[PDB]
Amino acid sequence: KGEMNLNALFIGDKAENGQLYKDLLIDLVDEHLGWRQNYMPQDMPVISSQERTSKSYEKTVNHMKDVLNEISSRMRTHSVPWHTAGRYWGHMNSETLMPSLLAYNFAMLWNGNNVAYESSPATSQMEEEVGHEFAHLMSYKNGWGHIVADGSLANLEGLWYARNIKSLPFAMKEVKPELVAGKSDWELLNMPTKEIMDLLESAEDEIDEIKAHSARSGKHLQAIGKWLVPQTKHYSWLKAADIIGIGLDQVIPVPVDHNYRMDINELEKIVRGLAEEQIPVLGVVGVVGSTEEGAVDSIDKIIALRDELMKDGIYYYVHVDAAYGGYGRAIFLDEDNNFIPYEDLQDVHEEYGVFKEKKEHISREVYDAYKAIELAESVTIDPHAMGYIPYSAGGIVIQDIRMRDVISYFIPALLGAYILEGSKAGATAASVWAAHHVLPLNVAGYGKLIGASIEGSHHFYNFLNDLTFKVGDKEIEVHTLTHPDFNMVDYVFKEKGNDDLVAMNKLNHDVYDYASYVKGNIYNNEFITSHTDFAIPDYGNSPLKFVNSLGFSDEEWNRAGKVTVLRAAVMTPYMNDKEEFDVYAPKIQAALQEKLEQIYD
Amino acid sequence: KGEMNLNALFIGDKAENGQLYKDLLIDLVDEHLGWRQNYMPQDMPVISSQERTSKSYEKTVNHMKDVLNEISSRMRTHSVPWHTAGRYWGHMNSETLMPSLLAYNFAMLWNGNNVAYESSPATSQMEEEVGHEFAHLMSYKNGWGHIVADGSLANLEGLWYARNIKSLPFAMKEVKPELVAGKSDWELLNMPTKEIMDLLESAEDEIDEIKAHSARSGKHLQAIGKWLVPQTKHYSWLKAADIIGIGLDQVIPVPVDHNYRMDINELEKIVRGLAEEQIPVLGVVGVVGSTEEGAVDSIDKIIALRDELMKDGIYYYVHVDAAYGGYGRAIFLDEDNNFIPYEDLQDVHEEYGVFKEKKEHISREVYDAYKAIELAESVTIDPHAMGYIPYSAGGIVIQDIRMRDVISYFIPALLGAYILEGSKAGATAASVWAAHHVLPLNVAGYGKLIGASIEGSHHFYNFLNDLTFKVGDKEIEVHTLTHPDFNMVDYVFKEKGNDDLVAMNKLNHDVYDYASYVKGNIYNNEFITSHTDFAIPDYGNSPLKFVNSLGFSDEEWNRAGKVTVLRAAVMTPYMNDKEEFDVYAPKIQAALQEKLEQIYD
């Protein structure tokens, strides 16, 4: 039964459900104040009745009102209207799920600390469950997970896992070489991750000593190997190296295709090349849902190469960075957590309400990529991304629960023993738990929400291709960068006969200026988007096919050095129906017209 | 004018101000829904009237209600009643400030991302100000700061600063040795931090290259030196080494006194000893407000030694870990941000309402320690500690704004360039900003809140000393560990004639069991506290004077190996008046009596 109305789980583009929120809000608030009053009910209120009616109180209350009135003016002047159903087409931001907003404020009134069960016996039991729901979303059979502060710190917590794991073999040589007897110092730096715990767990009475000689000691950080990341990586990855101690100098970027997914052949060249030079590979990162392109790296083809190289004695750790796309894997899961066969996807999506038109919306490349995330050792998934949970809430999931003992310090009692950070809000766990439990992590819940964002991005794609604008005696047309592998549709504007790639980049960068906070009050902006510069230094000639299809030469490309593209991670849940989009399409067009008519007069 | 009622800035032990909260809550909510409706007011609500009255909606709304009703049952069964005015005497948890709770929920409805101004043009302008308010709280003249996820990640961000800074000299040798010409490879690893930027800023066109050869490269992580921390350190510090790459093996614990503050003489022995062996010192951490003892390390005496050793060619970075105590430095600041002279403290505290009895409440040791934090390079301050802001919100403050260029990547535009983490809630900034602006960070605001927690801890101290309990034909008495240097009062229970330190530890650890979530429903617990085990491995014979004053020999001490103490970081704002405490004292005593009468029958 796809009978869930997603339009009820949101306050609304025009606050249509504002009464629902306020009623559920005050109903939850009143339940908390009642708990308080009934804790030791023999206790008399300390704040007297006469004090609550005194001038001391009024002057203090009237100042809180004045401070909140200042906060309100500033929030209502500068904040971004990404609640609009179809005028915000930019960053990874729309509305957030009402069940999470309500459960956060409700839980914040108890202000539990998840670092220790004794300061959160209930929100910590939620995060335990939230952790298993993450693992089952990844089809891990004995995995685990927890809520991270943000995705950048979950990528770091992953590299922490890797960095420590590559070093464990060497350390079992120095502490109990009976575990790695007969193993060359290259065989040690290329052991599969499953073998390492199966050994680490074997040495029961020595786990603690073995870990003391790990990378936790501070040594073997240049021996563990190089970190391989897509050329289109997030800065979290460059900084993660800096902090973990591998170094930004030991980070190798693997070139990307013209779909801006890692070239699996260029990946091979590098891994084999490094082993001929006898340098190990600490790990590779597969990006399911890129930052500026919305690209899904082929996890299926990364773990394939690893399975082929594992016969030539070369193993790599795979960490999937699904900060954006992690929650989209529920669109692939049935109500039993079994992965829908591709042949039955369009059919099942139609019976559950995931998609409104029974077409192909997802590729077998993206489907198989998502399915192979189950064979990687850790994944980064951000609830404050495609989970529709408010900031600040990220996630990390590990394939094997035992893997947390490689970073462990001394329910998971102090769950801060098995995490990188420390104090955590139990209210952030309640907001995630609530979302996962109102919206199941399969096609009966989040599947429908992910699907509305995807289908809404596809209407945006076809709307942009057909777009042409006559501004004066000029004719500007809009070009899409690539076919969306998820919900991010990228686009550029170009003068019909202008072979200047420098000028095309000044058109797009002026459109951003008028469709952002830069030019004008944003409360009067009828269209808002994002901008990104793809530059040869960090992207290569990956954007050359596209720039060439627009009339640009490899000489103008190598001159300008960058193509400025406009980004639209479509996360609106109100643009799945073509009829609703067709209502806001004329409004996006009337805005982009007037914006273009203002940078040319 | 100390005319601020702090009893209005809290919901209340018995929800006395619950209407105030609900009224201000719904008033702020309605202001947000109005902004939304007036963004592009020509737009028609997409959720139809007929849909909001359809069965699809009801069934989905009725399930959200069912999920929230489950969350509510679990939160109202297991959460801890630290709202009570005088029955919770344990962890660093009481109520939170109403202005922050309101401003967080208000700002969460916009869900801005502080990693980039374009996704938070208002909550990022608040965090900029929140950052300067941190720096002025530390009497920095050209400092900076920002909100961290938690204190453990702010300690790490500090060590990141240090780790990179010690390495900069070596790197200016490899990139522009004209900056460090004539400087021995020991003089480089012992340059004062001010000299390093004054040089780093001098090399304008080479900053980026110089940083590429820093610890960011991955090299010189064992050359930068050893990290010195108090024996009574937080685990954040052990883990910070692991992650930053210095190693848990390059961490030297400096022994603590019997006041459990670093022995400044034992500190000297180590620093000079290390330089005779030619090992540099990466930095020392001074703990203003310890975890289990509430101890304030002598910052005044740490920066003194550094000023004396800086003539023998030995410099150390000082980072103050004031996660707990950071906000208590406002009790020392007048309304002009000038540090009150100790001679005038009791007087000024009486005219502003900070203390209710004109006694001495703070020592010149703690006063001068707080005042010398101004000469350390970075400080960790947690709003979710003595700032009374709800989780999750920590802080880091740096003495020199330019110091952020040593970790910088590419208003502070992307403030995520000058931070360790990434995505941040702008709502966490609004809750901190609101608190700082309802409660000024001097004696006219937070001074009064800190003072009520201190004075409330002192009544707890004198209440425990005089405490004796006749349980059966036995007589148990209560002993305080040390005189509170802040708001944490520690205590032990002991059988009058029992020379067993093992048994005394089983009395206290059984009291914890009955005064915690362990034994019984916590909604029927009339007293809740915390427990900690001070063990020779990590504390030394620091607890020997105390264990000796109770009738224990150095042989029973060395046998048991640990003393179990009960911890009470008194953060209640309702125990400053002796009359109010004297109302809850009989209730703490009746509870501890019945608890003791249950572990002995």
Ligand SMILES: Cc1ncc(COP(=O)(O)O)c(CNCCc2ccc(O)c(O)c2)c1O
């Ligand atoms: C694939 C991938 N991994 C990690 C990150 C960073 O995750 P964080 O949660 O931010 O730590 C990202 C990029 N995420 C961009 C998030 C974002 C959201 C709103 C904004 O306004 C801005 O500027 C950025 C990623 O793609």
Ligand SMILES: Cc1ncc(COP(=O)(O)O)c(CNCCc2ccc(O)c(O)c2)c1O
């Ligand atoms: C001096 C000092 N520095 C850092 C920390 C850790 O800071 P975090 O904000 O937690 O990252 C601490 C210890 N803080 C204990 C915090 C706390 C609060 C509520 C609880 O229920 C528990 O268990 C812990 C510190 O003292």
Ligand SMILES: [Mg+2]
């Ligand atoms: Mg640009």
Ligand SMILES: [Mg+2]
């Ligand atoms: Mg114990």
